[PDB]
């Protein structure tokens, strides 16, 4: 006969949710990675031979956990910064000496019983006329919904990488397969104590400074045939994109309240021009040709078309940025405008606008005010992914349109955490054999 | 010969307090059920045999911990959203054209600080105090900052299951007619307490548990007149309360965001707040309650008086049903005598009060927003907080008044059957055994 | 030959840093003594026989946590108190009717947030600065919001006990005349430090620990000229201070339940606060300190100077007793010179201050409420913080000056007899032992 026996420290795991903590190489950052445990310079990415694992990035709890942590870190970093509640006053504006508005208003100086007049330049997107009757009085946007909070000028929004590591007794399974579509039995799997440096870069309609595919365009989607589901595309090579803010801004500081400083834009040195981004037309042309070819595999012999968003709020209908403090809003209609078929000076300029009063989380409770950055600022990054949506309300016929989707910041990080999944190891295992305990 | 031997996993415990925590059934509730850990769908209640335990719900420390959690949860629900300190501006009021209401008007700042605005509102007389001569001040703005009760959350007393950390246990007494103290001979153990609704009522226990077969009286010292005498009914007494005033709701923005809500015009005839209770059902209850008191002590006439009097936060029955706090005058109930021998509801006038504290805390105050339209409410009266008046030596009759004046005793009527103990799974005893080398 | 053998419960340790937790001996104190865990019934110190190891008070992280912990407690005791943000209104000052006091008048909003109130108050010139010259402004108003400490909680240096979690222990050096960094004898271990009083002060340690049998001079580097030199006294040099101004406090409510206290009026003639010290005792005590100072380095030319100069917070002697904060001109003490050869009270003029930045924080400003009536106090001077500026060739002479420019070194003089270590009871050693199957 056979008897049951137990074995400790056995290799086996199960899918389960667990808390994750910060980890990063190494004060003045919004993510507060300096008050975090340092990362291990020897990642034990141990390869697991012959194991098969089922991964579903659309169901892991890490993406949702990261979303809450990023929001928590953002709110926490603003708690000690000065509040801009007093700015909600009548704003008398005039045209700049079209996109800017030279405004004058009374401000509460350090002495609470004294008010001082201040001249400032506010973008038209951050100003909304209080009385339509006269375009002279204006009220700051988001003033009738939440209190304005100014970002601390010392801290910066640089997306420094952060490694998400689980406590002891849990492991992160990494999928090494070249071309994991994001859901399936990853053939090439390895175990690592925790993920690599994840850069929390906030973006919309495009993935910046993200990971790149190995040698084939990866199109991942929980339901490629659905319309309400977002389609994430990953490029094999990076498409360099560079922008610039030609307005040579002159930042001026005036103290309001008991020693609390306020930063605003002063006079512009030289000519004033709209913000814009550049991208090689030749590189982007071949990129869409390859992307459309791969996407065509999910619909057979059909043509692919790209449109310029669906319309609505500026927060979701345009690309975003976190360049040195500023927050750009670029009109991507110059890129998602073309047609493709089965068979098939060099730069594209995207008009952009800058808005300081932002939220970047679709929340109506808190309002972010980005202080202006002095002098000309240039921004360069690599395009590694796109957030697409299948636009269709009729028969698929011979063509199908696609637009840069999104409307959910969770999809931004899903494109980077697709390679991982958290599991709980159960070192207890029972199996039978031909031995009996002595007595 | 007898050698000592240690036993592990011994079933023995000792009385001791611990760090209790919540548990509830599956952001918009003041008790924060979403944040609390979900409760087990099948709590494994184990019955015990031959065991007797000494219960003392008065000396119980978990009741005080629950009092802290309720207050802690209250602050955590008011603190996040809008505060109401800017409303300390002077008020100009006059009588309503259509007694208990005043058409108050005052100057206030709109969304933009540079611009002002003149508004009109209808505040209850209890929420307004004179300052002079038609000038008044908002009550409580000379003692604490007002915090408007955030309307996105509801004050519905959803039950919360109270659990204890692992290694401890809660003893649940199931003996019929078991008062607060005594040796329980039907003890049972359970990981967490059953669904307990934290009602904020005072002077009368609403929506609480009921007795098994007869009325039970609880008091650490019934002879002491300064000790509360909690009474529990066997059959509940339905009570219905309503405010016929339609009370339309309006809103104004005081500074950036902070959408303040205030009462508008009263649609229809104005009327006072009141409650209804069946005379026969309530009168019959006092007959048995008085009989129970007579059987315990003072085998003579028993009488009930209309409280002691004082502030409305102490000498009046209050409840939270309907979203607006009520302050009812229970003088119409405790107005009867009981000797040894022995459509039609009783009306109780009530007054609404928006500026409240509900915890006798003079450092904090909260403003309840108005509820549009008429509000319907019904509840089961399962207990009372009686306080026998002992200012004079009893001769032939005793005077009982619905006193209280303490919020801890309100919930003590529900946790009377619980006691937390720490498990001691290690013990020793003698045995004729010898461990070899 | 021999084989390995692992032991448990081994008495070994390593110099490591750990998180300390307070245990205030047995609500009304800034250090939150009522919140700390109860102190031990008695210090369970175990004497370490035959043990001798190195000590280092200038590198241990325990002193750093003491500074940070005290900082957190100070801020934690200020957050629930009233804030004086609306008090930044301009001030119109004039000379007092009866030189360092100014009769300032300003406007403030009463309890109602609509009406203004004109008041008159007395503010010390140190905390009042001009704007151009009849208009003035409060100091630190252009740096941070002024916060008022609750008048019912005092800043008395109540002792607190520092403790280590299980697995960590603090070694206690008990060598008479122990100077510091180096070998120590008569070591002892205890799970919690003795009652240490966080006596906040500058260039003068009040109510500190007296020397065992002789004057002790300690510093991480005596040869270093630009470093602090701490001295411990074996005898207590009693200091007596008093504020003869009969202050009469008055108050107003700047907001709902937000009372503000200020100096209403002074009865009699204004007299600057001062500190007394017996000339004979200080002269003799300071002479002994000079002798030990000469032993370490140099011969003769033991000269003391009147501070360095600059900000008042560092130049003067910080002192607090009864609620008020004092800043005295210590030039009367450190004014002498000696060689190998070798009424009755020294008075130190003092200027009271109300706006202070304890812990030298620009982001926070404290405002001590004025204490009514005459206030007098006494303390024991047990330690001095001295610095030298002998950068030039000290062949003929050099001098010393008071200061420190840091609060961390203040507690270092008290925690000099402690060191935290980590206990790793897992040890190994060879032995003729063989394991069986």
């Amino acid at each position: 006969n056979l008897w049951v026996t137990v074995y400790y420290g056995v290799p086996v795991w199960r899918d389960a949710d667990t808390t994750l903590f910060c980890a990063s190489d190494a004060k003045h950052n919004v993510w507060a990675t300096h008050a975090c445990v340092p990362t291990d310079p020897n990642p034990q990415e141990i390869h697991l031979d012959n194991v098969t694992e089922k991964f579903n990035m659309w169901k892991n709890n890490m993406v949702e956990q990261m979303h809450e942590d990023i929001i928590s870190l953002w709110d926490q970093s603003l708690k000690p910064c000065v509040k801009l509640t007093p700015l909600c006053v009548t704003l008398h504006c005039t045209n700049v000496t079209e996109g800017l508005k030279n405004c004058s208003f009374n401000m509460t100086t350090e002495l609470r019983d004294k008010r001082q007049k201040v001249y400032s330049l506010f973008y038209r997107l951050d100003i909304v006329p209080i009385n339509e009757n006269q375009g002279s009085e204006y009220r700051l946007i988001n003033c009738n919904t939440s209190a304005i909070t100014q970002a601390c000028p010392k801290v910066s929004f640089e997306p420094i990488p952060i490694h998400y590591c689980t406590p002891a007794g849990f492991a992160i399974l990494k999928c090494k397969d070249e071309g994991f579509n994001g859901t399936g039995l990853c053939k090439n799997v390895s175990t690592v104590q925790c993920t690599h440096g994840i850069k929390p870069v906030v973006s919309t309609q495009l993935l910046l400074n993200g990971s790149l595919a190995e040698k084939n365009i990866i199109i991942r989607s929980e339901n490629i045939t659905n319309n309400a589901k977002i389609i994430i595309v990953q490029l094999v090579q990076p498409v360099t994109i560079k922008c610039i803010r030609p307005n040579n801004n002159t930042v001026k500081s005036i103290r309001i309240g008991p020693g609390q400083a306020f930063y605003y834009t002063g006079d512009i040195i030289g000519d004033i021009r709209q913000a814009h981004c550049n991208v090689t037309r030749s590189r982007w042309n071949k990129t869409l040709q390859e992307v459309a070819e791969k996407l065509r595999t999910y619909f057979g012999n059909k043509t692919i078309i790209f449109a310029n968003s669906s319309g609505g709020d500026l927060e979701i209908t345009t690309h975003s940025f976190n360049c040195g403090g500023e927050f750009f809003y670029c009109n991507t209609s110059g890129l998602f405008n073309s047609t493709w078929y089965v068979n098939s000076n060099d730069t594209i300029t995207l008009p952009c606008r800058i808005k300081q009063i932002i939220n970047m989380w679709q929340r109506a409770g808190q309002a972010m005010y980005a202080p202006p950055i002095p002098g000309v600022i240039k921004c360069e990054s690599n395009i590694t992914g796109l957030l697409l949506t299948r636009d269709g309300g009729k028969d698929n016929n011979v063509n199908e349109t696609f637009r840069p989707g999104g409307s959910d910041m969770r999809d931004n990080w899903r494109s980077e955490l697709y390679k991982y999944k958290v599991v709980e190891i159960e070192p207890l295992g029972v199996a039978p054999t031909r031995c009996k305990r002595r007595v | 010969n007898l050698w000592v031997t240690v036993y592990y996993g011994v079933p023995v415990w000792r009385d001791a307090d611990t760090t209790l925590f919540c548990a509830s059934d599956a952001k918009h509730n003041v008790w924060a059920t979403h944040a609390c850990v979900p409760t087990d769908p099948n709590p494994q209640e184990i019955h015990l045999d031959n065991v007797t335990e000494k219960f003392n719900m008065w000396k119980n420390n978990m009741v005080e911990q629950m009092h802290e959690d309720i207050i802690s949860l209250w602050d955590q629900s008011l603190k996040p959203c809008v505060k109401l300190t800017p409303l300390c501006v002077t008020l100009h009021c006059t009588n309503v054209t259509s007694e208990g209401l005043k058409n108050c008007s005052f100057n206030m700042t709109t969304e933009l600080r540079d611009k002002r605005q003149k508004v009109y509102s209808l505040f209850y007389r209890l929420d307004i105090v004179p300052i002079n001569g038609s000038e008044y001040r908002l009550i409580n703005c000379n003692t604490s900052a007002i915090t408007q009760a955030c309307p996105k959350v509801s004050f519905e007393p959803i039950p919360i299951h109270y659990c204890t950390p692992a290694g401890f246990a809660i003893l649940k007494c199931k003996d019929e007619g078991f008062n607060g103290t005594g040796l329980c001979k039907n003890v049972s153990t359970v990981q967490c307490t059953h669904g307990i609704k934290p009602v904020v009522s005072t002077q009368l226990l609403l929506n609480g548990s009921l007795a098994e077969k007869n009325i039970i009286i609880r008091s650490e010292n019934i002879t002491n007149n300064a000790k509360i005498i909690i009474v529990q009914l066997v059959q509940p007494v339905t009570i219905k309360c309503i405010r016929p005033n339609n009370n339309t709701v309006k809103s104004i923005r005081i500074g950036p965001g902070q959408a303040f809500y205030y009462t508008g015009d009263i649609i229809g005839d104005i009327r006072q707040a009141h409650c209804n209770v069946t005379r026969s059902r309530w009168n019959k209850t006092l007959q048995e309650v008085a009989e129970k008191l007579r059987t315990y002590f003072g085998n003579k006439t028993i009488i009930f008086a209309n409280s002691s009097g004082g502030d409305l936060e102490i000498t009046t029955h209050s409840f939270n049903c309907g979203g607006e706090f009520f302050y009812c005058n229970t003088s119409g109930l405790f107005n009867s005598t009981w000797y040894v021998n022995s459509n039609d509801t009783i009306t109780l006038p009530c007054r609404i009060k928006q500026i409240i504290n509900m915890w006798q805390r003079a450092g904090q105050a909260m403003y309840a927003p108005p509820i549009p339209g008429v509000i319907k409410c019904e509840s089961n009266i399962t207990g009372l907080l009686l306080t026998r008046d002992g200012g004079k030596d009893n001769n032939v009759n005793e005077t009982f008044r619905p006193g209280g004046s303490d919020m801890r005793d309100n919930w003590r009527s529900e946790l009377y059957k619980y006691k937390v103990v720490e498990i001691e799974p290690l013990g020793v005893a003698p045995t004729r055994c010898k461990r070899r080398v | 030959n021999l084989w390995v053998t692992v032991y448990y419960g081994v008495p070994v340790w390593r110099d490591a840093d750990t998180t300390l937790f307070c245990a205030s001996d047995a609500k009304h104190n800034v250090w939150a003594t009522h919140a700390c865990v109860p102190t031990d019934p008695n210090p369970q110190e175990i004497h370490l026989d035959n043990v001798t190891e190195k000590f280092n008070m200038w590198k241990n992280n325990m002193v750093e946590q003491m500074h940070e912990d005290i900082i957190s407690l100070w801020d934690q005791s200020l957050k629930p108190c009233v804030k004086l943000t609306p008090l930044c209104v301009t001030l119109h000052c004039t000379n007092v009717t009866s030189e360092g006091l100014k009769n300032c008048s300003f406007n403030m909003t009463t309890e109602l947030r609509d009406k203004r109130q004109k008041v008159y108050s007395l503010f010390y010139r140190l905390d009042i600065v001009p704007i151009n010259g009849s208009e003035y402004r409060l100091i630190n108003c252009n740096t941070s919001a002024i916060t008022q400490a609750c008048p019912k909680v005092s800043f008395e240096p109540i002792p607190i006990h520092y403790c280590t979690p299980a697995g960590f222990a603090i070694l206690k050096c008990k060598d008479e005349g122990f100077n510091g960094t180096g070998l120590c004898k008569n070591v002892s271990t205890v799970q919690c430090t003795h009652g240490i009083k966080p006596v906040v002060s500058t260039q003068l340690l009040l109510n500190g620990s007296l020397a065992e049998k002789n004057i002790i001079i300690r510093s991480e580097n005596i040869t270093n000229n630009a470093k602090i030199i701490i001295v411990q006294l074996v005898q207590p040099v009693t200091i007596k201070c008093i504020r003869p101004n009969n202050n009469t406090v008055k108050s107003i409510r700047i907001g709902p339940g937000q009372a503000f206290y200020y100096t209403g009026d002074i009865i009699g003639d204004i007299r600057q606060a001062h500190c007394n010290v017996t000339r004979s005792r200080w002269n003799k005590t300071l002479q002994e300190v000079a002798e030990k100072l000469r032993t370490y380095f140099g011969n003769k030319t033991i000269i003391f100077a009147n501070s360095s100069g600059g900000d008042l917070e560092i130049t003067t002697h910080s002192f607090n007793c009864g609620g008020e904060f004092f800043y005295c001109n210590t030039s009367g003490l450190f004014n002498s010179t000696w060689y190998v050869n070798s009424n009755d009270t020294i008075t130190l003029p003092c200027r009271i201050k109300q706006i202070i930045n304890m812990w030298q924080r620009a982001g926070q400003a404290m405002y001590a409420p004025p204490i009514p009536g005459v206030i007098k106090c006494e303390s024991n001077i047990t330690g001095l913080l001295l610095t030298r500026d002998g950068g030039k060739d000290n062949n003929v002479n050099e001098t010393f000056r008071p200061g420190g420019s840091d609060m961390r070194d203040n507690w270092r003089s008290e925690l000099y007899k402690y060191k935290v270590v980590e206990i790793e009871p897992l040890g190994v050693a060879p032995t003729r032992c063989k394991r069986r199957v």
Partner: antibody
Amino acid sequence: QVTLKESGPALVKPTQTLTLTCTFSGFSLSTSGMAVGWIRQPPGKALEWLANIYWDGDTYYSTSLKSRLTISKDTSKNQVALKMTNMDPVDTATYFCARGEESFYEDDYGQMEWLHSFDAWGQGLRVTVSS
Amino acid sequence: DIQMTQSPPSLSASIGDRVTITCRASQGISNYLAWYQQKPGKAPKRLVYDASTLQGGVPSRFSGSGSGTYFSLTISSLQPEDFATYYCLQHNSHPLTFGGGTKVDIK
């Protein structure tokens, strides 16, 4: 019922100094906010503000008349007087004494002050400049 | 200086006809503006303050509108007692200033 009553010399010689004074009964000018001012209207011309005095004694005058206008209040007898020098022929007009109002607010961040339009006006008196 | 203006300075109306006048400012003066009625050779009287709140006791025939920099007084129906001069005053900040006046003539 509040009422204003102004008085002064009906005729004044040129280049001389004159004083006007108006009485009030409905207010005492000390109820934290009450103000009072003077306005003038030439024959057939538009109105013209002259000066305003508030409860706290604060005075405000017109930009063109700041060099020859003065306003004072006598709260002990409920009176407000205006003094004007350098009488010129164009100054002949009908002078009115009207009560104004002022309000304050304190939203923690900073003090806010608001003015109000005149509500009550006096009967008025005509001043003629003749040689 | 906060200069004020108003148009039409003089107009001709008819009995029972609706008529309105406008007042413009040199800059934004919020809604701190009021209007006054003045009979020929009489003390002025206020009829609307804050540009929207009708003065108590005055009939509902008059009404105010506008804000920021463009204000206006509307009269739904004229009556013979309307023979008077209307003035627009601003009280946003000192110095106070009156409008140019508007005379009405009934045909």
